């Protein structure tokens, strides 16, 4: 169901035309900064990688990166970019709510704008899928648009695109994107290291203007619940 919508967007058949507002033709500044800060290690997963710009940036710095996405069209595009640039990032189709076959593969996760599509129990299914796909003690980074950021993006997109509506007034449930919904998502199997104020770069299809809007940058520590860990502990105990 959701595969088709995004695939259509990447084919260029949506109101966005050639440029979906998240497909900025560069890595997200927050992830460039996170890399320079030294907080990316080991085998990296870019979950919901889209057309691969974040993953490709990391590939160019020597990281072993895998980009996963539900849209085969996005992955086709990312693979073409990898070929043209001569970088060896792994791009494959996968449902981030499932991730069967990727068990305990990753040491770090990055997420630019996948988590913020999930709400309620779907965000927890994503958290769990990430937990299954991560090595014990892995770190997941999640860049999520805030209500403040979405209100700005919505107004700017609404002015630019006929099909998109202007945002509502007033502050005040399921459509909300506070720090709390993200905290609630990554509960079982995770520990919140930090939630920070950050930015998310987007592009306006009309002018190709780039804007940065407010976003939350979460950092979550995957626990050490693993049979491999249990076995180490048994070896030392016995």
């Amino acid at each position: 169901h959701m595969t088709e919508v995004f695939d259509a967007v990447y084919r260029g058949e949506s109101p966005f035309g050639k440029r979906p507002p998240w497909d900025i033709g560069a890595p997200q500044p927050a992830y460039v900064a996170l890399e320079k800060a030294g907080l990316i290690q080991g085998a990296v997963l870019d979950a919901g990688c889209g057309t691969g710009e974040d993953a490709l940036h990391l590939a160019g710095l020597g990281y072993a990166v895998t980009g996963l996405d539900l849209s085969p069209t996005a992955i086709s595009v990312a693979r073409d970019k990898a070929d043209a640039r001569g970088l060896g990032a792994v791009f494959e189709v996968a449902d981030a709510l499932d991730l069967t076959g990727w068990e305990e593969r990753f040491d770090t996760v990055i997420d630019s704008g996948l988590a913020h599509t999930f709400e309620g129990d779907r965000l927890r299914a994503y958290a769990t899928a990430l937990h299954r796909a991560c090595r014990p003690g892995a770190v997941a980074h999640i860049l999520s648009i805030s209500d403040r950021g979405s209100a700005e993006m919505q107004a700017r997109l609404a002015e630019a695109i006929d099909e998109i509506p202007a945002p509502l007034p007033d502050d005040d449930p399921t459509l909300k994107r506070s720090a709390d919904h993200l905290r609630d998502g990554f509960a079982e199997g995770w520990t919140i290291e930090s939630i920070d104020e950050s930015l998310m770069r987007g592009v306006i299809p009309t002018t190709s203007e780039l804007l940065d809007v407010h976003a939350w940058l979460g950092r979550f520590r995957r626990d050490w619940n693993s049979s491999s860990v249990d076995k180490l502990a048994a070896a030392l105990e016995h």
Partner: peptide, 8 residues
Amino acid sequence: XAXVXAXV
């Protein structure tokens, strides 16, 4: 909008 529904 972009991208909560997801994402037009």
